[PDB]
């Protein structure tokens, strides 16, 4: 499978197994884990070493993503600031998580939403937002664009 | 192998390989080509047996493919009325070709884009993608759910 | 469907898909909602987010708008007056709310009733008010030229 | 987005690139021009398509704009009353022909300053900061509201 995907230095894009491996988040300085599934479970909640933030989203044509698309902001810098690193994962890594990592670029690095794309699957080129997700950032885009968030 | 690939009773969907078999456009009726590429060839061109229309694009970063369908509909639409079929074809993942086919569906039979994607892609599975494109199909979805003209 | 359409950037003229919306108003800053229908529901009163007005006209060929025009007004004044939006829509957004706002205009803007139709349908193509709506605010502008309102 | 801005159906703003769109002027039905600086080319001129009007205006800090607006307003109104658009532009940051713009709205449309200011920017949100046109701008706001000739 893919591996996990480092985007920033304190922001990685990755499957389920990646949610997983301990060993692999902790050598990366991993604090924060968000979790875009309605039905996974968060991986290690027991251990105590993370803090967890779920999105519980499906994967459809009918799913509103940007609605939570402040919350992980939030939380991804609430990682940053704190100098520990965030995994951001949905089943594949494929189109719900990559879809807010996209979105963190365009409002947080002020990327177009073309670039955003590009560089997220530049690093990681399994990545396939759904044609509901992409019409989301492209409103989003012209929010921002406009200052309306 | 393969061969183009039926859309509607009228219009055909293929690549660079598809275009070249003249039996297969024979058998299925075919009497008009669209030819979405500016450098390959006009297939059994000098057999005179079809009507072509060129659209000299590239799979580029900023191609601009709107620019084209408005003409591409008139020419399946004049192939359409004479009962003849139109093949659409580019290149190998039929990414121009395709977002010409499913503008046309999202226009003339007024499926959503995500709707006219799936039944293009239900039918041909292999479509490559392209930002660009998408980006531009999404728009026209807006403009026409929108109503302009 | 449509989507909603800004008319200025406090007045927004929709449908009652648009009316519900939650996350959409509360971006937008509307602070106030017109509803142009006798049977719709007033969507989220009992969330006490909104001001509401009902104006309950049927899209008939006796309806009188005229005499809710004033009203309506004094409304979206109030919304302009302390820097918040007003959301206006029937069941389409195409005939009963677009009258309002074509009227609207037409007092506030001192558009004639010609470049404050123009300026609706160039922001909402859909827009059709019905031939008696149309000869209202034929009237309204004669009342508007002569000072009589 | 990366053309000309339209203001009302037969105004549209913009800056040194997107005077040169020449496919866009057509569509938008342009038939009119004001370019609203000392030295910059009349764009198209040699076509013969389109009238013009130049404002020899510069960017500057005693720059004069409003002894300019009666004159533009004339040549709004003709493209208006003949059924043409009329496109405004400048430079980047569309400062002076934005200063046009808005007092259009503010003379014909009587919207106050700040609600013109907030329509143009709500359609074009990059409009560079000039004290001196936007003190021309209060000050005709003041003679306005006076009823001054």
Same mark, same amino acid.
Request: hydrophobic fraction near 40%; proline fraction near 4%.
């Given at each position: 499978? #893919?591996?996990?995907?480092?985007?920033?230095?304190?922001?990685?894009?990755?499957?389920?197994?990646?949610?997983?491996?301990?060993?692999?988040? *902790?050598?990366?300085?991993?604090?924060?884990?968000?979790?875009?599934?309605?039905?996974?479970?968060?991986?290690?909640?027991?251990?105590?070493?993370?803090?967890?933030?779920?999105?519980?989203?499906?994967?459809?044509?009918?799913?509103?993503?940007?609605?939570?698309?402040?919350?992980?902001?939030?939380?991804?810098?609430? #990682?940053?600031?704190?100098?520990?690193?965030?995994?951001?994962?949905? *089943?594949?890594?494929?189109?719900?998580?990559?879809?807010?990592?996209?979105?963190?670029?365009?409002?947080?690095?002020?990327?177009?939403?073309?670039?955003?794309?590009?560089?997220?699957?530049?690093?990681?080129?399994?990545?396939?937002?759904?044609?509901?997700?992409?019409? *989301?950032?492209?409103?989003?885009?012209?929010?921002?664009?406009?200052?309306?968030?």
């Amino acid at each position: 499978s #893919a591996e996990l995907t480092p985007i920033l230095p304190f922001l990685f894009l990755g499957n389920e197994q990646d949610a997983q491996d301990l060993d692999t988040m *902790q050598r990366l300085n991993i604090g924060y884990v968000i979790n875009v599934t309605t039905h996974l479970p968060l991986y290690h909640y027991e251990k105590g070493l993370f803090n967890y933030k779920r999105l519980p989203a499906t994967d459809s044509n009918k799913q509103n993503l940007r609605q939570y698309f402040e919350e992980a902001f939030e939380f991804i810098e609430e #990682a940053h600031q704190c100098g520990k690193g965030l995994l951001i994962h949905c *089943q594949a890594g494929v189109s719900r998580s990559a879809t807010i990592v996209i979105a963190y670029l365009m409002k947080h690095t002020r990327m177009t939403m073309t670039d955003a794309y590009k560089f997220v699957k530049g690093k990681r080129p399994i990545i396939s937002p759904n044609l509901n997700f992409m019409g *989301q950032l492209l409103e989003f885009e012209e929010d921002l664009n406009n200052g309306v968030t």
